[PDB]
C-alpha cells in the first residue's frame, strides 16, 4: 500500500463498475457510504471515480469521515464537508506488521495549518514550534515533522495496521462516464412481447 502522509490517487475512468462485489464481500471491516447508500451504486452513473489508498492505525479509521479532527484528518488526509463517495477499510495485521517493528509506515504530526480537502503535502522541512528560527537543524522547538508507526504483530487491536480505500465519485459537467452493469435477460421470438434494445 501507500503511506498515510503521501496517499495514492488512482483515477478510475470509463468502465463497468460493479460495487456489489465490493459491498457483499464481507471481508471489509468498515464500509460507510455518505453521499449515497451502498445498494444504489450499481444503478447510477458519474463522470469520474477517484480511489485513494493508504494505511493507518486501527482506531484512526474514525477520522476518515466528513467533519473530523485529529492528527490524521488535520494534516494527513482531509475529506470535504459534502463528501459523496464511500470509505472502505479492512484489517491487515498479517501483511504490514513484522516482528521487530515495521518502521516504513510514517505519518505527519506537525504542520502549520490544517489541510484543504483533498490536499497533499510531501515536504520534509524542519518544523518550527517556538519563535526561534531553526536553520535546518534539529533541537528544542525544532522538530522533524514525520513519525513512524512501529507496527508489531503482538499489538492489541486498535494498534494493528488497517488498510483504507476512499472512493470519491465526482460529477463535473461532461457528457457521461462509468456506470454500473446492465443486467440482460434472454431474447424470445415468435411471441408478441414487450422489448427494450
Amino acid at each position: 500500500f501507500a503511506s498515510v502522509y503521501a496517499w495514492n490517487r488512482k483515477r478510475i475512468s470509463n468502465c463497468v463498475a460493479d460495487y456489489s462485489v465490493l459491498y457483499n464481500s464481507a471481508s471489509f471491516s468498515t464500509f460507510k457510504c455518505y453521499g449515497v447508500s451502498p445498494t444504489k451504486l450499481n444503478d447510477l452513473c458519474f463522470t469520474n471515480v477517484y480511489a485513494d489508498s493508504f494505511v493507518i492505525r486501527g482506531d484512526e479509521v474514525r477520522q476518515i469521515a466528513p467533519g473530523q479532527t485529529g492528527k490524521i484528518a488535520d494534516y494527513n488526509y482531509k475529506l470535504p464537508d459534502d463528501f459523496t463517495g464511500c470509505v472502505i477499510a479492512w484489517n491487515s495485521n498479517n501483511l504490514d506488521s513484522k516482528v521487530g517493528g515495521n518502521y516504513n509506515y510514517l505519518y505527519r504530526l506537525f504542520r502549520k495549518s490544517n489541510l484543504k480537502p483533498f490536499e497533499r503535502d510531501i515536504s520534509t522541512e524542519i518544523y518550527q514550534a517556538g519563535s526561534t528560527p531553526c536553520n535546518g537543524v534539529e533541537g528544542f522547538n525544532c522538530y522533524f515533522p514525520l513519525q513512524s508507526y512501529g507496527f508489531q504483530p503482538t499489538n492489541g487491536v486498535g494498534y494493528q495496521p488497517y488498510r483504507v480505500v476512499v472512493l470519491s465519485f465526482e460529477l463535473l459537467h461532461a457528457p457521461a462516464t462509468v456506470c454500473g452493469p446492465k443486467k440482460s435477460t434472454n431474447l424470445v421470438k415468435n411471441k408478441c412481447v414487450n422489448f427494450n434494445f
Partner: antibody, heavy 121, light 109 residues
Framework: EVQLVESGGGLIQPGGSLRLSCAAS????????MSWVRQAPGKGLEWVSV???????YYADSVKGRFTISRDNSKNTLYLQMNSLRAEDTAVYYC???????????????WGQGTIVTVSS | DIQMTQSPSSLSASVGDRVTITCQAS??????FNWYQQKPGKAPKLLIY???NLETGVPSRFSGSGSGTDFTFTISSLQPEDIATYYC??????????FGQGTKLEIKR
C-alpha cells in the same frame, strides 16, 4: 530556560467562571501541543485537555461541555476557560508541552509547577 | 479503554539495595509507555519514555524494561535523594492519556 507560569487559582463558589492564564517562554505556543493535567489532593494524576497546532480541541469527557481551551499566538499565553463548576474540581493544575523524543513515541517533557484552584465558597 | 494497575504502593527502600515496581494493563500496547517522577511538592518530570531510553539528566541508575503487557522499573538501590511518586502513562491515537495511580518509596534510616 523554559518554564511556563500560570496566573489564576483563588477560591470561588460552585458555579463560577474563573479562567487560567498559562504564559510560556522559550517556544511558540501556536506550533506545539500544549496540554492541561490536573491532580486532586492525595490522588493520582488525570488528563484534562489538549489543543493541536491547527485549532482542534479535545476534552477529558468528565469535564467536557464545561471547559474551553484557547491561546494567544501574539502573547504566548495559554487559556483554560473554565466555567460552571461542580465542586469536585479542587485540584492543582499543570501545563505541559507534548513533544516527540523518538523515531516513534511522544511525551510530556516540560511542566509548569502547578497552581491551586479551590471551590466551596 | 485501557487501565494500568501499579501493584506495590509505597514500599520500603534501604540504602544499598534494589527496587522493582511493577505495572500491567488491559489489551496489550507496545512501547507507548512513559514513567514519570514527581517529588513531594514539585512538578513531575519524565525520565523513561517509550519503555527505556533514559532521559538526559537522569543518572546511571533508574533502568526500565518489558514491552508488551508488563513493565518493570528498576533502581540500583534507593538513594536518599528519592522518596518521590512514580506514575505510568499510556496514550492512544484518539485523544486520551490514562495515568496509572503510582507508588511512593521510602527509606530505612
Amino acid at each position: 530556560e523554559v518554564q511556563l507560569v500560570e496566573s489564576g487559582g483563588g477560591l470561588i463558589q460552585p458555579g463560577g467562571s474563573l479562567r487560567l492564564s498559562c504564559a510560556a517562554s522559550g517556544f511558540t505556543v501556536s506550533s506545539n501541543y500544549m496540554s492541561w493535567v490536573r491532580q486532586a489532593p492525595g490522588k493520582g494524576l488525570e488528563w484534562v485537555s489538549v489543543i493541536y497546532s491547527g485549532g482542534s480541541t479535545y476534552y477529558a469527557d468528565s469535564v467536557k461541555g464545561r471547559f474551553t481551551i484557547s491561546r494567544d499566538n501574539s502573547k504566548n499565553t495559554l487559556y483554560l476557560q473554565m466555567n460552571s463548576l461542580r465542586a469536585e474540581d479542587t485540584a492543582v493544575y499543570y501545563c505541559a508541552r507534548e513533544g516527540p523524543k523518538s523515531i516513534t513515541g511522544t511525551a510530556f517533557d516540560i511542566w509548569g509547577q502547578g497552581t491551586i484552584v479551590t471551590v466551596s465558597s | 479503554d485501557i487501565q494500568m494497575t501499579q501493584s506495590p504502593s509505597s514500599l520500603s527502600a534501604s540504602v544499598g539495595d534494589r527496587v522493582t515496581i511493577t505495572c500491567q494493563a488491559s489489551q496489550d500496547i507496545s512501547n507507548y509507555f512513559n514513567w514519570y517522577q514527581q517529588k513531594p511538592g514539585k512538578a513531575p518530570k519524565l525520565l523513561i519514555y517509550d519503555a527505556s531510553n533514559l532521559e538526559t539528566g537522569v543518572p546511571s541508575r533508574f533502568s526500565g524494561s518489558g514491552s508488551g503487557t508488563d513493565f518493570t522499573f528498576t533502581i540500583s538501590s534507593l538513594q536518599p535523594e528519592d522518596i518521590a511518586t512514580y506514575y505510568c502513562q499510556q496514550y492512544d491515537n484518539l485523544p486520551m492519556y490514562t495515568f496509572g495511580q503510582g507508588t511512593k518509596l521510602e527509606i530505612k534510616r
